[PDB]
Amino acid sequence: GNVLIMAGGTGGHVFPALACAREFQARGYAVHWLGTPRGIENDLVPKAGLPLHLIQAPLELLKSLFQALRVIRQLRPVCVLGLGGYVTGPGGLAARLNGVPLVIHEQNAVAGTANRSLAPIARRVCEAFPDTFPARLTTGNPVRGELFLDAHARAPLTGRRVNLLVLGGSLGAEPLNKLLPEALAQVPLEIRPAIRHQAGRQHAEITAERYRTVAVEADVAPFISDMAAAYAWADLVICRAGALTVSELTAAGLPAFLVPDDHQTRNAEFLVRSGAGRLLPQKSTGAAELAAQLSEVLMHPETLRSMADQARSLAKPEATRTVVDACLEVA
Numbered sequence: 330g331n332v333l334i335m336a337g338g339t340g341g342h343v344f345p346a347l348a349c350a351r352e353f354q355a356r357g358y359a360v361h362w363l364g365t366p367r368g369i370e371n372d373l374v375p376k377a378g379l380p381l382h383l384i385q386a387p388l389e390l391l392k393s394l395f396q397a398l399r400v401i402r403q404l405r406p407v408c409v410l411g412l413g414g415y416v417t418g419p420g421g422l423a424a425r426l427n428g429v430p431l432v433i434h435e436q437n438a439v440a441g442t443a444n445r446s447l448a449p450i451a452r453r454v455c456e457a458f459p460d461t462f463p464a465r466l467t468t469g470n471p472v473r474g475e476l477f478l479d480a481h482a483r484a485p486l487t488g489r490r491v492n493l494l495v496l497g498g499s500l501g502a503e504p505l506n507k508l509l510p511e512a513l514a515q516v517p518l519e520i521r522p523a524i525r526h527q528a529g530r531q532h533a534e535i536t537a538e539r540y541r542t543v544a545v546e547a548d549v550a551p552f553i554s555d556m557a558a559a560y561a562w563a564d565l566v567i568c569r570a571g572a573l574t575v576s577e578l579t580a581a582g583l584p585a586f587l588v589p590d591d592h593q594t595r596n597a598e599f600l601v602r603s604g605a606g607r608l609l610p611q612k613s614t615g616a617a618e619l620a621a622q623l624s625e626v627l628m629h630p631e632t633l634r635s636m637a638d639q640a641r642s643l644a645k646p647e648a649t650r651t652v653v654d655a656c657l658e659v660a
């Protein structure tokens with residue numbers, strides 16, 4: 330029958346859901362999506378060929394519930410899977426009111442306010458990171474099959490310039506856009522890596538000028554759809570510690586320098602704890618300090634191979650199947 334997937338806002342909620350949508354489709358189920366206007370599901374969900382049902386101070390919360398109650402009443406789904414955003418709260422409750430089974434998924438290291446409110450009413454609570462829910466099943470984060478790379482995906486580092494990928498993420502954090510050109514100018518041009526910077530949608534034009542003025546050289550973009558290609562090119566990542574970028578770095582088996590209820594700092598810790606990632610706090614690390622940290626791994630790239638070997642082992646390839654298996658066991 331029909332399946333309802335509720336997710337929106339940023340890529341961290343929309344992308345694990347698009348991967349779940351592909352899995353339900355291969356099993357012979359009709360997937361329908363639950364979103365809100367303005368969010369990024371309006372860009373991605375219609376492109377995937379999937380039906381987008383849109384939802385819109387307590388009287389405002391009830392308006393969202395009526396619309397969600399209607400969408401569920403019309404689709405009579407076998408299961409409803411929530412993944413994050415404003416949508417899951419009124420959507421997940423609507424699912425219970427109509428006696429339709431509900432499964433929730435938490436991408437982050439600390440559970441979200443909606444996921445904490447919805448967990449007691451869900452049949453299965455799927456978690457990405459361990460210890461996030463005090464109880465439930467640890468599936469990991471559902472990552473796009475294409476983002477899974479082996480240690481043969483890239484050329485040896487020895488006698489080659491390192492490729493540096495700077496990630497936004499989904500909206501394109503600002504800071505990083507400022508810190509990177511200033512920091513990269515202090516790194517000798519003999520060791521300076523090749524740069525691909527994913528700035529914001531409104532910050533791509535300005536981040537280009539920032540690199541241009543300090544005389545660096547980078548391929549600055551607002552957003553990259555060709556992510557499997559972006560990860561294969563990269564030897565090192567300097568990123569934001571959003572749930573999916575963290576889980577994708579493991580699938581891609583990539584060393585990272587992460588700049589993160591302190592959800593991101595905890596997300597970064599799961600890489601850091603094993604030696605897969607390196608924690609660089611925003612409030613502390615200046616342009617001089619990032620340059621010095623980069624300089625040591627460029628001078629000694631064998632460091633990147635150990636970080637990559639550890640990252641590859643933290644990947645959870647069955648994250649998508651087990652989330653969908655948890656939905657279809659209760660459906």
Ligand SMILES: CC(=O)N[C@H]1[C@@H](OP(=O)(O)OP(=O)(O)OC[C@H]2O[C@@H](n3ccc(=O)[nH]c3=O)[C@H](O)[C@@H]2O)O[C@H](CO)[C@@H](O)[C@@H]1O
Nearest residue numbers: 339340341342344436498499500552553556571572573574
């Ligand atoms: C600033 C902010 O509020 N960030 C939050 C946001 O992160 P956000 O969703 O922005 O970042 P995440 O790392 O969670 O997810 C990024 C997703 O967007 C994709 N991507 C991004 C850029 C691009 O060029 N192409 C592309 O496909 C990534 O491959 C990945 O699939 O949502 C999450 C909520 O669950 C949290 O972890 C973050 O703290």
